[PDB]
Amino acid sequence: AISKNLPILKNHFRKHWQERVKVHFDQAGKKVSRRNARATRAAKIAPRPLDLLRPVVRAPTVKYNRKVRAGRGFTLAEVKAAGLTAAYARTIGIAVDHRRQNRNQEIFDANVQRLKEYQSKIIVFPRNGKAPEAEQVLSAAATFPIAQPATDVEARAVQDNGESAFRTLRLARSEKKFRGIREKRAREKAEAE
Amino acid sequence: GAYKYLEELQRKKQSDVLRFLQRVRVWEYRQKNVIHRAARPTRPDKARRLGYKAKQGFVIYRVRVRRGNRKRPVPKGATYGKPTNQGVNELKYQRSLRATAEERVGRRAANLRVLNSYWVNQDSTYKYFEVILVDPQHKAIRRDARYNWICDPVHKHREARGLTATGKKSRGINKGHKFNNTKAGRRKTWKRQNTLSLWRYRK
Amino acid sequence: TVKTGIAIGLNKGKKVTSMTPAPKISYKKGAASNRTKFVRSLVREIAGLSPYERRLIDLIRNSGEKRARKVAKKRLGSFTRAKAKVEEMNNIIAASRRH
Amino acid sequence: WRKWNVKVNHNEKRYATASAIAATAVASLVLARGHRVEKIPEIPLVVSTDL
Amino acid sequence: PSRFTKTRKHRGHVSAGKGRIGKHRKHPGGRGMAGGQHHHRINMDKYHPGYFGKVGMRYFHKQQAHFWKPVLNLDKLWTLIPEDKRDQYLKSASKETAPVIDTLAAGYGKILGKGRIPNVPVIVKARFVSKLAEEKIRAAGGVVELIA
RNA sequence: UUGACAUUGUGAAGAGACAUAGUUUC
RNA sequence: GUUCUUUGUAAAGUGCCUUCGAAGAGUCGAGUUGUUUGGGAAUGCAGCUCUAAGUGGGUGGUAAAUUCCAUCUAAAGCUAA
RNA sequence: UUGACCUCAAAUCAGGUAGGAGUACCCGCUGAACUUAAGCAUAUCAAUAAGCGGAGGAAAAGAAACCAACCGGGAUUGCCUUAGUAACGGCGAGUGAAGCGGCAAAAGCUCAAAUUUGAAAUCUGGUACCUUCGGUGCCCGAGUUGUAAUUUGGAGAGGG
Ligand SMILES: [Mg+2]
Ligand SMILES: [Mg+2]
Ligand SMILES: [Mg+2]
Ligand SMILES: [Mg+2]
Ligand SMILES: [Mg+2]
Ligand SMILES: [Mg+2]
Ligand SMILES: [Mg+2]
Ligand SMILES: [Mg+2]
Ligand SMILES: [Mg+2]
Ligand SMILES: [Mg+2]
Ligand SMILES: [Mg+2]
Ligand SMILES: [Mg+2]
Ligand SMILES: [Mg+2]
Ligand SMILES: [Mg+2]
Ligand SMILES: [Mg+2]
Ligand SMILES: [Mg+2]
Ligand SMILES: [Mg+2]
Ligand SMILES: [Mg+2]
Ligand SMILES: [Mg+2]
Ligand SMILES: [Mg+2]
Ligand SMILES: [Mg+2]
Ligand SMILES: [Mg+2]
Ligand SMILES: [Mg+2]
Ligand SMILES: [Mg+2]
Ligand SMILES: [Mg+2]
Ligand SMILES: [Mg+2]
Ligand SMILES: [Mg+2]
Ligand SMILES: [Mg+2]
Ligand SMILES: [Mg+2]
Ligand SMILES: [Mg+2]
Ligand SMILES: [Mg+2]
Ligand SMILES: [Mg+2]
Ligand SMILES: [Mg+2]
Ligand SMILES: [Mg+2]
Ligand SMILES: [Mg+2]
Ligand SMILES: [Mg+2]
Ligand SMILES: [Mg+2]
Ligand SMILES: [Mg+2]
Ligand SMILES: [Mg+2]
Ligand SMILES: [Mg+2]
Ligand SMILES: [Mg+2]
Ligand SMILES: [Mg+2]
Ligand SMILES: [Mg+2]
Ligand SMILES: [Mg+2]
Ligand SMILES: [Mg+2]
Ligand SMILES: [Mg+2]
Ligand SMILES: [Mg+2]
Ligand SMILES: [Mg+2]
Ligand SMILES: [Mg+2]
Ligand SMILES: [Mg+2]
Ligand SMILES: [Mg+2]
Ligand SMILES: [Mg+2]
Ligand SMILES: [Mg+2]
């Protein structure tokens, strides 16, 4: 059972794997089904849209923090700033998230601005039951898209202060590397009897 | 309130007053039947943070279960297979003694619904538990927005399915890296990572 | 903190105008409180000391504060708790049979 | 779990349909294909939007 | 399709192309990757030197991402500017108005120096650089601006 | 089968220490 | 959509000042045995022995002492897609 | 002598409830060997089959004692991916997950611990009447060893 110059494979089929094969014959069906659900929810949900206002949020980790992404809900802070309590904001098609925190002003403001636009671009019918039919826009998401913030300008003046990027990286990496040793030298000499 | 004092007093299980108390009670229970109706909680502060309430429809039951390992049944210790499986005697059982306790009373009061249960004592041979139960046909309960959930059929014998607090412990349902394996439910997630998924347009 | 604005080194990371959010009360799940202080004080003196706690203040007196931790560490979970346990008996000792 | 459907590159797919559209001109091809188009005015045969 | 398959061609011959002597049996080699260090060693060494044993250090719970850092060479670099916009900058190699290029924005982690950019100022914003890339960049009157 | 720990409590005499007051252990 | 009773000397929302701010125990945690896991000086589960605290507690995938920092808030509960 | 209370019993006592079946899917327990390793015991088959207890139209999970280490994210479930990877492994045969990203769907919450103390404000049942999935008056009873209102950490409470 080993022969030729072939790559070594790892095909995990030593269990009774044929008892666990899911072949999605129901792709087309579920799609239909899925679409019907949406038409139904739309109709049931009167003029409301099919989704809630979601906040901007900067994504986690070194890999994605370049990008900005729809968040879960809006932080008790952001809501307060946008001139409303959370209990109400929830009934007005706005998602609120008690566990997100604001450390970033640029994002915070973006989110407050998101809220002012929303508030101005919805209308909220009186509780009575007068119901002045108003036609549903289906997507809070499409109505208030989230764009990446422009971080500079296309062209600009070159300024070369002189001290190179590469060496700064190198040095920067270095200071960290020996930060503790240097401190141990600071301690050990502090005990200059 | 007196419940704060009770709670604190009970964390001193080797304090003098408490082990007199433990001593006398553990003889009394042991005298009574292995499952017997309790008249009232002997730990009302424990009962009540665990869902109990002093209204008709709420029931307490005291039960004791044998301690120690699970001796693997099997005639004469014979195992009839590989050596890894030849043990008999240091074998442990994946449910807690508390679960056994819950199950054995839930069976005894099948009109009732196990809600929760709590430890009250032990000696070398038994652990002693009180199980707090609810009667979902009692109107006092069937009303009561807060408790009448317990009346829906999805909650028949929660103790038999690992849905009481002990059960969720042993099933290992908790968020995190420590619970990857069991968490959405171990057999379920096994089945998942061991299902071959084929699309009409093969990916 | 302040981040340096480059991608390695000490305060590595993006410069952002900062905010520092209102404190969460979860985060104070540990805090004492007058009510607990009172009740715990009262219970303690109601119910006295446990066996190992007695063996403990003996060792403290008669063998020092280091052998005390070593035993208390084996008795309790671990070292940090033994730290606080010895520490506690130390203050039973001071407060009582002394000043 | 036999392979029932088949993936075709979207672009190769269009190459094909384009080729096919192109050939609905070319009377020889339309004739060879069955299709009784000797007595038709011209190919491509374009009729009024009124249809 | 079966139609074009050699087993159609073998119908009528006894052994199905598998020999009268050697036969087609279940598992003569053993199964799978068996025999590696024994009857299948000549094929493993040769074709697979390196297979058995260990090398360096284990790393528990390695999160690939930590090390996310695509490379872009000066080679390209100007491709990160859209071509219409691009021709405009080539002509007017210039301080005061040099193109900004956010390479991080383009999804690169490090700039490396494969070969010869034109002698035209660029302003290059990146997380890392090779010593060389920065050198070449500078020799065109440009700078690297370290971002994060 | 043998040991240790838990179930395990109460007196008394004799040993065992802060090193010839009694908390502790045999 | 319509119509009838006003549920109220009722119930709720929001700004400032001050003082407070109760938060789950034979559990957490520990040793050991066994099982299980990709989880490696130990991923989960369970038995026996030990057994907490309150500026505490858990986690931070290499054991330990020291000093920090980050992040949640266990040992009680319901819940459509 | 009479009346309570606690604990414990008895009725063919008033009214209810559990059992069994089904079991594709689901929540648990318990638990193999054939097999693979060209022998074989650890390993593998497999946390599989058989055995046992328990539900529903789904169940289970679920509003973080989470993930991270970011400019941070934000209940759960599933799909695409991560990845045949980190890792485990007579480091042999073999095995093998997670965080980020996109997407389906979206939804959030209540108890315990608090003196109503200028008024147990709460509830089962019997009974009469009614406009009966219920309401009201009345009477036994539950309940202070605590039934309502209020509060649930995102908070929140008391005075102003
Ligand atoms: Mg497979
Ligand atoms: Mg096999
Ligand atoms: Mg199917
Ligand atoms: Mg949607
Ligand atoms: Mg209306
Ligand atoms: Mg009763
Ligand atoms: Mg067997
Ligand atoms: Mg074994
Ligand atoms: Mg006994
Ligand atoms: Mg696993
Ligand atoms: Mg294919
Ligand atoms: Mg073929
Ligand atoms: Mg064919
Ligand atoms: Mg042919
Ligand atoms: Mg031939
Ligand atoms: Mg021939
Ligand atoms: Mg032939
Ligand atoms: Mg021939
Ligand atoms: Mg051949
Ligand atoms: Mg032959
Ligand atoms: Mg031969
Ligand atoms: Mg073959
Ligand atoms: Mg190998
Ligand atoms: Mg290149
Ligand atoms: Mg003996
Ligand atoms: Mg809690
Ligand atoms: Mg072990
Ligand atoms: Mg087992
Ligand atoms: Mg283990
Ligand atoms: Mg440590
Ligand atoms: Mg965070
Ligand atoms: Mg509850
Ligand atoms: Mg649930
Ligand atoms: Mg009857
Ligand atoms: Mg049944
Ligand atoms: Mg098994
Ligand atoms: Mg087979
Ligand atoms: Mg074999
Ligand atoms: Mg063979
Ligand atoms: Mg054999
Ligand atoms: Mg196994
Ligand atoms: Mg089975
Ligand atoms: Mg049914
Ligand atoms: Mg349902
Ligand atoms: Mg459904
Ligand atoms: Mg459910
Ligand atoms: Mg919470
Ligand atoms: Mg999540
Ligand atoms: Mg080897
Ligand atoms: Mg291999
Ligand atoms: Mg496995
Ligand atoms: Mg997502
Ligand atoms: Mg809800």
What strands, in cross-sheet order, belong to the sheet with E123-126? Answer: A155-156, E98-102, E123-126, E143-146
CA–centroid distance, E22 to ligand 21, in Å, is 6
For residue A163, the number of C-alpha atoms closer than 13 Å in the C-beta half-sphere is: 7
Residues of C in contact with A172 (CB under 8 A): 4, 6, 8-10, 12
For residue A164, the number of C-alpha atoms closer than 13 Å in the C-beta half-sphere is: 16
Q: Which chains touch A (3 or more CB pairs under 8 A)?
A: B, C, E
How many CB atoms lie under 10 A from the CB of residue E96?
10
- Which of B191, B195, B200 is nearest residue A25 as measured by Cβ atoms? B200
Whether the CB of B102 is less than 7 Å away from nucleic strand H comes out as no
How many CB atoms lie under 10 A from the CB of residue A62?
17
Residues E128 and E109: beta-carbon distance below 8 Å: yes
Residues of C in contact with E147 (CB under 8 A): 5-7
CB burial of residue C41 (10 Å; 0-12, 13-18, 19+):
exposed
CA–centroid distance, E86 to ligand 12, in Å, is 50
Which residue bears the tokens 């520490």? C87
Which residue bears the tokens 């994504």? A59
A/E interface, count of CB pairs below 8 Å: 87
CA distance A56 to A145: 10
How many CB atoms lie under 10 A from the CB of residue E95?
14
Rg, chain E, Cα only? 29
Kindly determine whether residue D7 and residue B200, on different chains, have CB atoms separated by under 8 Å: no
CA–centroid distance, D2 to ligand 11, in Å, is 11
- Which of E85, E96, E131 is nearest residue A166 as measured by Cβ atoms? E131
Phi, psi of B64 (to 5 degrees): -130, 145
Phi, psi of C84 (to 5 degrees): -70, -25
CA distance A70 to A100: 13
Query: Could you tell me the CA-to-CA distances from D5 to A20, B92, B198 in Å, in that order?
Result: 21, 52, 11
Give the distance, in angstroms, between the CA of residue C30 and the centroid of all CA atoms in the same chain: 11
Q: Which residue is nearest to nucleotide F19 (CA to C1')?
A: C62
Is the four-CA dihedral E93, E98, E99, E103 of positive or negative sign? positive
Beta bridge partners of E123: E100, E143
CA distance B1 to B3: 6
Whether the CB of B124 is less than 7 Å away from nucleic strand F comes out as yes
- Give strand ranges (E) for chain E: 71-73, 98-102, 110-112, 123-126, 128-129, 143-146
**CA nearest E68: which of A4, A21, A62, C52?**
A62
- Does an interface of 3+ CB pairs under 8 Å exist between C and D? no
CA distance A25 to B55: 55
CA distance E64 to A61: 11
- Does an interface of 3+ CB pairs under 8 Å exist between E and C? yes
Experimentally determined by? X-ray
Phi, psi of B116 (to 5 degrees): -165, 180
Kindly determine whether residue A152 and residue E144, on different chains, have CB atoms separated by under 8 Å: no
For residue C93, the distance in angstroms to the closest alpha carbon of chain E comes to: 47
CA distance E65 to A64: 9
Whether the CB of C64 is less than 7 Å away from nucleic strand F comes out as no
**CA nearest B166: which of B64, B98, B105, B68?**
B98
**CA nearest B65: which of B127, B21, B136?**
B127
| Chain H bases near protein CB atoms (7 A cut-off) | 6-9, 15-19, 26-34, 36-39, 41-48, 53-62, 64-88, 91-102, 104-115, 120, 122-125, 141-148, 153-155
CA distance A28 to B201: 12
- The pair of three-digit structure tokens given for residue E1, joined into one six-digit string: 């399709």
CA–centroid distance, E75 to ligand 24, in Å, is 6
Chain D residue closest to B203 (CA)? Answer: D7
Q: CB of E148 within 8 Å of any CB in chain C?
A: yes
Kindly determine whether residue B202 and residue D1, on different chains, have CB atoms separated by under 8 Å: no
- The pair of three-digit structure tokens given for residue E43, joined into one six-digit string: 């094929």
Query: Could you tell me the CA-to-CA distances from A92 to A42, A52, A84, A89, A108 in Å, in that order?
Result: 16, 9, 11, 5, 20
Calculate the angstrom distance between C1' of H21 and CA of B109.
22
Kindly determine whether residue C9 and residue A108, on different chains, have CB atoms separated by under 8 Å: no
CA distance E119 to E90: 9
Secondary structure element (H or E) that encloses residue D30, with its range: helix D27-32
Kindly determine whether residue A17 and residue B200, on different chains, have CB atoms separated by under 8 Å: no
